[PDB]
Write an enzyme that holds these catalytic residues in place. Structure first.
Site, short mmCIF file in Angstrom:
data_model
loop_
_atom_site.label_atom_id
_atom_site.label_comp_id
_atom_site.label_asym_id
_atom_site.label_seq_id
_atom_site.Cartn_x
_atom_site.Cartn_y
_atom_site.Cartn_z
N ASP A 117 0.80 -1.20 0.00
CA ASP A 117 0.00 0.00 0.00
C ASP A 117 0.85 1.27 0.00
O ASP A 117 0.76 2.04 0.95
CB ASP A 117 -0.92 -0.04 1.25
CG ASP A 117 -1.97 1.06 1.26
OD1 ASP A 117 -1.95 1.89 0.35
OD2 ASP A 117 -2.80 1.14 2.20
N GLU A 156 -2.24 10.21 -1.56
CA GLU A 156 -3.49 9.48 -1.60
C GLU A 156 -4.12 9.34 -0.24
O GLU A 156 -5.31 9.02 -0.16
CB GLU A 156 -3.32 8.08 -2.14
CG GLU A 156 -4.67 7.51 -2.46
CD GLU A 156 -4.84 6.06 -2.11
OE1 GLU A 156 -4.73 5.22 -3.04
OE2 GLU A 156 -5.11 5.77 -0.93
N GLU A 157 -3.36 9.52 0.83
CA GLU A 157 -3.79 8.83 2.02
C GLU A 157 -4.85 9.62 2.76
O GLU A 157 -6.05 9.47 2.48
CB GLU A 157 -2.61 8.52 2.91
CG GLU A 157 -2.21 7.07 2.67
CD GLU A 157 -3.35 6.13 2.27
OE1 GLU A 157 -3.47 5.90 1.07
OE2 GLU A 157 -3.99 5.45 3.09
N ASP A 200 -3.18 -1.28 -6.79
CA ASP A 200 -3.25 -0.99 -5.37
C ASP A 200 -3.32 -2.29 -4.60
O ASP A 200 -3.79 -3.31 -5.10
CB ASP A 200 -4.48 -0.13 -5.02
CG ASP A 200 -4.11 1.05 -4.13
OD1 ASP A 200 -3.42 0.83 -3.11
OD2 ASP A 200 -4.49 2.20 -4.47
N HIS A 282 -3.27 -1.64 6.46
CA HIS A 282 -3.30 -0.50 7.37
C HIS A 282 -3.00 -0.94 8.78
O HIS A 282 -3.66 -0.53 9.73
CB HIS A 282 -4.64 0.22 7.34
CG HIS A 282 -4.77 1.21 6.24
ND1 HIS A 282 -5.82 2.10 6.17
CD2 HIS A 282 -3.98 1.47 5.18
CE1 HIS A 282 -5.67 2.86 5.11
NE2 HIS A 282 -4.56 2.50 4.48
O1 LIG Z 1 -7.78 5.17 2.77
C1 LIG Z 1 -8.69 4.81 3.45
N1 LIG Z 1 -8.76 5.16 4.87
C2 LIG Z 1 -10.05 4.55 5.39
C3 LIG Z 1 -10.61 4.57 6.69
C4 LIG Z 1 -11.84 3.89 6.92
C5 LIG Z 1 -12.51 3.18 5.83
C6 LIG Z 1 -11.96 3.16 4.54
O2 LIG Z 1 -12.42 2.50 3.35
C7 LIG Z 1 -13.73 2.00 3.14
C8 LIG Z 1 -14.17 1.00 4.17
C9 LIG Z 1 -13.50 -0.36 3.99
N2 LIG Z 1 -13.94 -1.01 2.69
C10 LIG Z 1 -14.16 -0.06 1.57
C11 LIG Z 1 -13.67 1.41 1.75
C12 LIG Z 1 -10.72 3.85 4.32
C13 LIG Z 1 -9.91 3.97 3.05
C14 LIG Z 1 -10.27 3.42 1.86
C15 LIG Z 1 -9.18 3.00 0.82
C16 LIG Z 1 -9.46 2.67 -0.48
C17 LIG Z 1 -8.40 2.33 -1.33
C18 LIG Z 1 -7.04 2.33 -0.87
N3 LIG Z 1 -5.85 2.05 -1.42
C19 LIG Z 1 -4.87 2.22 -0.48
N4 LIG Z 1 -5.44 2.60 0.67
C20 LIG Z 1 -6.77 2.67 0.42
C21 LIG Z 1 -7.85 2.97 1.24
ZN LIG Z 2 -3.69 3.10 2.55
#
Ligand SMILES: O=C1Nc2cccc(OC3CCNCC3)c2/C1=C/c1ccc2[nH]cnc2c1
Ligand SMILES: [Zn+2]
Length: 313
Positions: A117, A156-157, A200, A282
Site C-alpha cells: 500500500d 493518496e492517504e 493498489d 493498514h
Molecule cells: O484510505 C482509506 N482510509 C479509510 C478509513 C476507513 C474506511 C476506509 O475504506 C472504506 C471502508 C473499507 N472497505 C471499503 C472502503 C478507508 C480507506 C479506503 C481505501 C481505499 C483504497 C485504498 N488504497 C490504499 N489505501 C486505500 C484505502
Molecule cells: Zn492506505
C-alpha cells in the site's frame, strides 16, 4: 489461448525472461519500504528515487514533477506527483498509476511502510518499464500512436480522518492539472488517457480481483486470459488452479482511490485492486515479509504480457 491480439508464444516467453525478480525485489521494492508520509524526508527521497530511476531508462521518458501545496486537517502540506510519459508527442497513452506516499500513523508505534500500500505496485511499474525498455524505445522511435504514461501519485492517504477533503490530494490535483493542459487531439491531456490502469493493495498472498468498471471489462478479460495462459505454459509459481487472481465476473463496486478524480472527468478506469483487502492492511504488519513473492512475481509477468499485448510490442 491462441486468441486475437495475443503474443506469439516465442515473444511472450522472451518478454517474461527479461523480467529480473531480484531487480524488482531489491533494486526497486526494498528501497521504497520506508515511512514516507507527505512532505516528510521519508517521502521526498522516494520521490527523488523514482524521479531518477525513470530518467536513467534508455527509452528516455519525459519525467516531470507536479508539485503543490494543499490544506489538510493538519497544516498546509506540500506535495509532488511524479508524471513519467514515454513519448509525449504521441496522441494517446496507457496510463498505469499508483501512489508512493504512505499513511501517516500516530507516533510511538512500529513505523508503517505499507508494502502492499503501495510499495509493491510502485516497484512493479519500475520493473515493467525497465524489463520492457528496449521495446518501448523501439516503438517510441517508431512514433507509435499510443505511448505509455506512468503516474506515481502523492498524497493518496489522509492525515487524520478519511474523506473527500482528506484523501487523493495528488490525483485530485494531477486531474485538475491535466484538464487545464491543451493537447492534440484532445482537447485536453485528460482525453489522452486511453486507459487509466490503477494498481493498489498488491502482493499479499492469494488476492482476488474483479472488474469494477464494466466499461473496461473487456480489458479485465485480457488479464484473466493472460493469467490462464501463463499457468498453462508453466510460468506461474504456486498457481495450482488455472484461475486464481482474476475472477469472474461483474460485481457491485466503488472503492475511493486515485482513479476517482480522473473518473470524474470521464476517464475509462481499470481498478486493479485486491478485494478483499490484504489481511494486514493498514496495520504495522504491511511489511516486506508478509508479501507473497511468487504472487508478486506472477503479477509482474501477468502485467508484463498485458503491457505488450496492449501496445503491440
Ligand atoms: O484510505 C482509506 N482510509 C479509510 C478509513 C476507513 C474506511 C476506509 O475504506 C472504506 C471502508 C473499507 N472497505 C471499503 C472502503 C478507508 C480507506 C479506503 C481505501 C481505499 C483504497 C485504498 N488504497 C490504499 N489505501 C486505500 C484505502
Ligand atoms: Zn492506505
Amino acid at each position: 489461448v491462441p486468441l486475437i491480439g495475443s503474443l506469439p508464444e516465442a515473444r511472450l516467453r522472451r518478454v517474461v525472461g527479461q523480467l529480473d525478480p531480484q531487480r524488482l525485489w531489491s533494486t526497486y521494492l526494498r528501497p521504497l519500504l520506508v515511512v514516507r508520509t507527505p512532505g516528510s524526508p521519508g517521502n521526498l527521497q522516494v520521490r527523488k528515487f523514482l524521479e531518477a530511476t525513470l530518467r536513467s531508462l534508455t527509452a528516455g521518458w519525459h519525467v516531470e514533477l507536479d508539485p503543490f501545496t494543499a490544506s489538510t486537517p493538519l497544516g498546509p502540506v506540500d506535495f509532488g506527483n511524479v508524471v513519467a510519459t514515454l513519448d509525449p508527442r504521441a496522441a494517446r497513452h496507457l496510463t498505469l498509476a499508483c501512489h508512493y506516499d504512505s499513511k501517516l500513523f500516530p507516533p510511538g508505534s512500529t513505523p508503517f511502510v505499507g508494502a502492499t500500500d503501495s510499495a509493491v505496485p510502485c516497484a512493479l511499474l519500475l520493473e515493467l518499464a525497465q524489463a520492457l525498455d528496449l521495446e518501448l524505445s523501439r516503438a517510441k522511435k517508431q512514433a507509435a500512436p499510443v505511448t505509455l504514461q506512468l503516474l506515481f501519485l502523492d498524497g493518496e492517504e489522509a492525515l487524520k480522518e478519511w474523506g473527500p477533503k482528506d484523501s487523493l490530494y495528488g490525483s485530485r490535483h494531477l486531474a485538475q492539472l491535466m484538464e487545464s493542459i491543451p493537447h492534440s487531439p484532445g482537447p485536453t491531456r485528460i482525453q489522452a488517457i486511453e486507459l487509466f490502469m490503477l494498481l493498489d493493495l498488491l502482493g499479499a498472498p492469494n488476492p482476488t480481483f474483479y472488474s469494477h468498471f464494466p466499461r473496461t471489462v473487456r480489458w479485465f478479460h485480457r488479464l484473466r486470459s493472460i493469467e490462464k495462459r501463463l499457468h498453462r505454459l508453466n510460468l506461474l509459481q504456486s498457481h495450482p488452479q488455472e484461475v486464481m487472481y482474476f475472477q469472474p465476473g461483474e460485481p457491485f463496486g466503488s472503492v475511493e482511490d486515485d482513479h476517482i478524480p480522473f473518473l470524474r472527468r470521464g476517464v475509462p478506469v481499470l481498478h486493479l485492486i485486491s478485494t478483499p483487502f490484504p489481511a494486514v492492511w493498514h496495520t504495522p504488519a504491511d511489511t516486506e515479509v508478509n508479501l507473497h513473492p511468487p504472487t508478486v512475481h506472477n503479477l509482474c509477468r501477468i502485467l508484463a504480457v498485458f503491457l505488450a499485448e496492449y501496445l503491440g510490442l
